Amino acid sequence: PDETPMFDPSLLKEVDWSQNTATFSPAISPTHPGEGLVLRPLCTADLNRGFFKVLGQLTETGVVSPEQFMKSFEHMKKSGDYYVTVVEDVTLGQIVATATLIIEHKFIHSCAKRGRVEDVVVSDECRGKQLGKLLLSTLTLLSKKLNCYKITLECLPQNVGFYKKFGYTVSEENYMCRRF
Amino acid sequence: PDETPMFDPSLLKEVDWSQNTATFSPAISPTHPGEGLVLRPLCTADLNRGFFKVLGQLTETGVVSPEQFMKSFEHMKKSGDYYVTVVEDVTLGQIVATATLIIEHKFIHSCAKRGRVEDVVVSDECRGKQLGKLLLSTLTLLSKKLNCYKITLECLPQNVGFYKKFGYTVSEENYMCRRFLK
Ligand SMILES: CC(C)(COP(=O)(O)OP(=O)(O)OC[C@H]1O[C@@H](n2cnc3c(N)ncnc32)[C@H](O)[C@@H]1OP(=O)(O)O)[C@H](O)C(=O)NCCC(=O)NCCS
Ligand SMILES: CC(C)(COP(=O)(O)OP(=O)(O)OC[C@H]1O[C@@H](n2cnc3c(N)ncnc32)[C@H](O)[C@@H]1OP(=O)(O)O)[C@H](O)C(=O)NCCC(=O)NCCS
Ligand SMILES: CC(=O)N[C@@H]1[C@@H](O)[C@H](O)[C@@H](COP(=O)(O)O)O[C@@H]1O
């Protein structure tokens, strides 16, 4: 594991924060996430900073080997299409929040790009401290900057009001699943 | 534009068709999609086989240069994660149906893979020929074969009964969208 980021950290900096609509108090931003905190791409050393401990609060992570993580990480990085983003408490050296933006390429809408928000979770001790809003507003604006024609996500009905804060609305389409 | 497929066509013969749950009458399969038809990966030469005319029946699919199409194709090919699959009517040399399987990589569920079914459309003159069922069944089984832990898709409630035929069920989760075009 090293400090190589999954994607160019500047992409987070250069998001047009003027387009944010979510309310912050105090007014944190991608460049100013809160003292002692950094908002950045996942890097391979994050395996040892409790990345999986955070993800484990959302759903099951099973047993993951360093080699398994490295291979997944390298594939994601190589694609250019995966924006796994974390908030790290630098004083503790621990990940405290994560969210992923995935870019999908299509042929419809003039060879469009489409965004998906995945795997959004704030560590329990850090909930209600604006990090979910920060992650969501930053990644949503990043997809618009990357020329996505739309961005989508799925959530339980109890979380709908949260995502509304970044301009998401409930689609008429149903989400259908088959589990193997 | 050439005949090179987006993915290994062998993968379509390796789908365990005995696991298909949808009812077909007449019996057709990935191997035998019907007389005059071939189910196969997209290739760049499909640009000139009416590929976009089919997509245009799904949603807006406007102006695209040959180089833009080839760039998207190569990018999709290079990832190994895109399975844009077509049915061609060989007598006419025209695409008559398309569906895409995308493989998404995760860190959850022990660094799992999950499938997405996207951009499913049969040309209206070929509907009721079981080509939509063929594509859905094949891609669903292919995702299983590729060790996805699940596969998902979104559709208007008006299409729910179609996807039920392949073992999909309506999830409790809401689908949410921010449209940057309107
Ligand atoms: C808790 C969670 C949903 C929100 O993140 P958070 O950091 O705790 O929330 P924030 O402090 O960033 O934002 C708080 C704001 O969102 C609102 N909010 C929080 N949860 C909400 C919900 N479920 N529905 C509607 N609004 C919600 C609060 O009222 C507050 O509103 P306001 O500050 O605008 O007045 C977070 O994303 C999380 O990890 N939760 C548990 C795992 C999870 O459910 N992940 C999402 C999978 S879809
Ligand atoms: C029309 C479409 C959805 C299905 O393809 P098709 O050629 O009509 O269907 P097939 O001949 O392969 O399968 C026919 C079966 O599916 C059923 N079916 C077709 N459309 C259906 C729908 N919208 N809802 C429920 N069932 C449907 C038929 O009743 C028939 O049932 P049966 O097998 O018991 O006889 C097709 O994929 C299409 O291009 N439609 C318009 C574009 C579109 O909406 N794409 C899907 C977006 S989520
Ligand atoms: C299974 C399936 O085919 N689902 C499609 C989706 O894949 C496609 O991208 C979208 C286009 O509609 P849009 O132009 O409004 O984004 O329609 C449906 O939701």
Contact A152 B175 (CB under 8 A): yes
- Any atom of ligand 1 within 6 Å of the Cβ of A112: no
How many Cβ atoms sit within 10 Å of the Cβ of residue B164?
13
Write the DSSP string, B86-123: EEEETTTTEEEEEEEEEEEE-SHHHH-EEEEEEEEEE-
Write the DSSP string, A77-97: HHHS-EEEEEEEETTTTEEEE
- Any atom of ligand 3 within 6 Å of the Cβ of B99: no
- The burial of A106, by beta-carbon neighbours within 10 Å (0-12 exposed, 13-18 middle, 19 or more buried), is given as buried
Q: Which residue has the tokens 């290994």?
A: B8
The answer as to whether B178 is a domain residue is no
Interval between CA A22 and ligand 1 midpoint (Å): 12
Q: Report the C-alpha gap between A101 and A147 in whole angstroms.
A: 13
How many Cβ atoms sit within 10 Å of the Cβ of residue B107?
24
Q: How many domains does chain B have?
A: 1
Mutation pick for ligand 2 pocket among B24, B25, B162, B168 (CB with most ligand atoms within 8 Å): B162
Residue B132 host element (H or E): helix B131-145
Q: Report the C-alpha gap between B49 and B108 in whole angstroms.
A: 40
- A-chain CB neighbours of B160 within 8 Å are 174, 176
Q: Which residues contact B55 (CB under 8 A, 6 or more apart)?
A: A107, A108, B61, B98, B119, B121
How many Cβ atoms sit within 10 Å of the Cβ of residue A125?
8
Mutation pick for ligand 3 pocket among B119, B158, B179 (CB with most ligand atoms within 8 Å): B119
The answer as to whether B85 is a domain residue is yes
DSSP B22: S
Interval between CA A168 and ligand 2 midpoint (Å): 29
The answer as to whether A177 is a domain residue is no
The answer as to whether B180 is a domain residue is no
Q: Which residues contact B14 (CB under 8 A, 6 or more apart)?
A: B145
Residue B21's CATH number: 3.40.630.30
DSSP B179: E
The answer as to whether A2 is a domain residue is no
Which residues have C-beta atoms less than 6 Å from ligand 2? B 23, 58, 120-122, 127-133, 155, 158-159, 161-162
Separation in Å, CA of A47 to nearest CA in chain B: 11
The answer as to whether B38 is a domain residue is yes
- β-bridge partners, A152: A116, B177
The answer as to whether A114 is a domain residue is yes
**Which residue range is the domain that position B78 belongs to?**
8-168
| Specified resolution (Å) | 1.8
The answer as to whether A178 is a domain residue is no
